[PDB]
A paper describes a structure:
Estrogen receptor alpha (ERα) is a ligand-dependent master transcriptional regulator and key driver of breast cancer pathology. SERMs and SERDs are comprised of a heterocyclic core that mimics hormone binding and a side-arm that disfavors the H12 agonist conformation. Rather, H12 packs into the AF-2 cleft via an LXXML motif to sterically preclude transcriptional coregulator binding.
In these structures, the T6Is are well ordered in the ligand binding pocket and form canonical ERα LBD antagonist conformations with H12 packed in the AF-2 cleft. Hydrogen bonds are formed between the T6I core, E353, R394, and a water molecule while the side arm forms a hydrogen bond with D351 to favor an antagonistic H12 conformation that is docked into the AF2-cleft. The T6I core is superimposable between the 10 structures but the side arms adopt divergent vectors near H12 that correlate with ligand-specific antagonistic differences. Interestingly, the F425 in H8 is rotated away from the ligand pocket in the T6I structures compared to laso and RAD1901.
Author numbering:
A (entry chain B): 306 to 330, 341 to 414, 421 to 460, 465 to 529, 533 to 549
B (entry chain A): 308 to 460, 465 to 530, 533 to 548
Write the structure that this text describes.
């Protein structure tokens, strides 16, 4: 039924689902504490992405396990667009590359690319939902049915992105060029997340399946 | 940047490297103990061909030597991997490292960390199969990896980066043209383009895991100066 939404209805839903900007509460203690509070709101966001809560709870958790760090990063990048050379983790926590620096420079470069492209908010929220759905889709009959559903939702977000660029009055050549540019930034965000996740796992901190499930607040029947 | 889409596809098809073979050395038959040695030799021989393929990707040799090396240092494992997945597409459940080196998932449960990567490779092969990926699309995807993977990692640098994005846009055009010319609708074109490019996030993911597996041998990774030597040919 979420697959009957129009592109306009898909955009409004995603804009309405957007999480709040949190405030910061040892730089590394503060970043971890900020991440942990953001995760809760990301779970609330995820449930409002059309199509997501039609999946089993088991597969929602898996998507969330695979994607949460990418989602944290693209949001960091989004809200840093307007602050060249700085990362706005929170309104009370702007850091530059002087205050690890490899991932920091990668984040800054992503924010610079979003600036060069004049990434719009409507496009940004489509990109987050693609990240949520795409990041774990490579990992039974029921499993196969779920991946079919995920790809249908992915296709409709692609339709939506294109719709926005049409509305913006880009030519069809510019639409598919810009679509491609945006999706290629997602492979760099995947790269950035791989580095963080290796770092967390090295600690021997990564949100467990049970913690994510608890946050999803499953229905009681 | 002057080429048509047909011309782009023509050049990429023409530059395709050969399918290489694992050694048929009788003094070194296949066993689980000889495996990473055979696989390493094969990759080392493929890298040589990959260098000379890269130089034939339109736009690539327009870059500085320094940047060409940086792009290859970022992308070589992803390019090996996508070549592997393409070779394996028509053999469900198996990875076709070479025509004489076709492995299944339990042959992979020899080394620690290996089965996990094997399954991601097999999943990618599965995805190619159900998308019925075409050869002409494959070569576009491989060239996007080459140009894209190191680009996010100075006046000359700003010109380099402008140039790389203009070549990516041309490849994007070429991909759409391929799909247009087959007969896909505009909707199907944009949906397929998106499907194809999202696979590149997984390939990056796999390359990071594989890169993590390779350093876990502590032997293997081509250094920056080694790659530069390979690309820095005389005339
Ligand atoms: C839920 C798991 N709990 C265990 C903590 O895992 C964490 C801990 C910290 C981060 C922060 C964080 C916080 C908020 C944000 O919006 C974004 C980020 C982005 C991020 C890069 C990834 N990060 C860093 O510090 C950083 C920045 C620059 C270079 C190297 C590292 C994310 C996840
Ligand atoms: C040029 C750099 N020096 C050489 C050392 O790096 C190497 C050593 C070995 C491989 C093989 C290899 C060979 C050929 C191929 O086409 C592709 C691959 C793919 C690959 C994943 C990476 N691999 C493995 O064994 C493997 C497979 C599954 C799960 C875990 C590991 C590649 C690179």
């Amino acid at each position: 039924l979420a697959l009957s939404l129009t592109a306009d209805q898909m955009v409004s839903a995603l804009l309405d689902a957007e999480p709040p900007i949190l405030y910061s509460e040892s730089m590394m203690g503060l970043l971890t504490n900020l991440a942990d509070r953001e995760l809760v709101h990301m779970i609330n966001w995820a449930k409002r992405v059309p199509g997501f809560v039609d999946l089993t709870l088991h597969d929602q958790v898996h998507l969330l396990e695979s994607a949460w760090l990418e989602i944290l990063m693209i949001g960091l990048v989004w809200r840093s667009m307007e602050h060249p050379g700085k990362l706005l983790f929170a309104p009370n926590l702007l850091l530059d590359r002087n205050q690890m620096v490899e991932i920091f420079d990668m984040l800054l470069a992503t924010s610079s690319r979003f600036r060069m492209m004049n990434l719009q908010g409507e496009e940004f929220v489509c990109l987050k939902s693609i990240i949520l759905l795409n990041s774990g889709v490579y990992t039974t009959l029921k499993s196969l049915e779920e991946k079919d559903h995920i790809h249908r939702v992915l296709d409709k977000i692609t339709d939506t992105l294109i719709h926005l660029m049409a509305k913006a009055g880009l030519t069809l050549q510019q639409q598919h060029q810009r679509l491609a540019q945006l999706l290629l930034i997602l492979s760099h965000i995947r790269h950035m997340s791989n580095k963080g996740m290796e770092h967390l796992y090295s600690m021997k901190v990564v949100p467990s399946y049970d913690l994510l499930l608890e946050m999803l607040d499953a229905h009681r029947l």
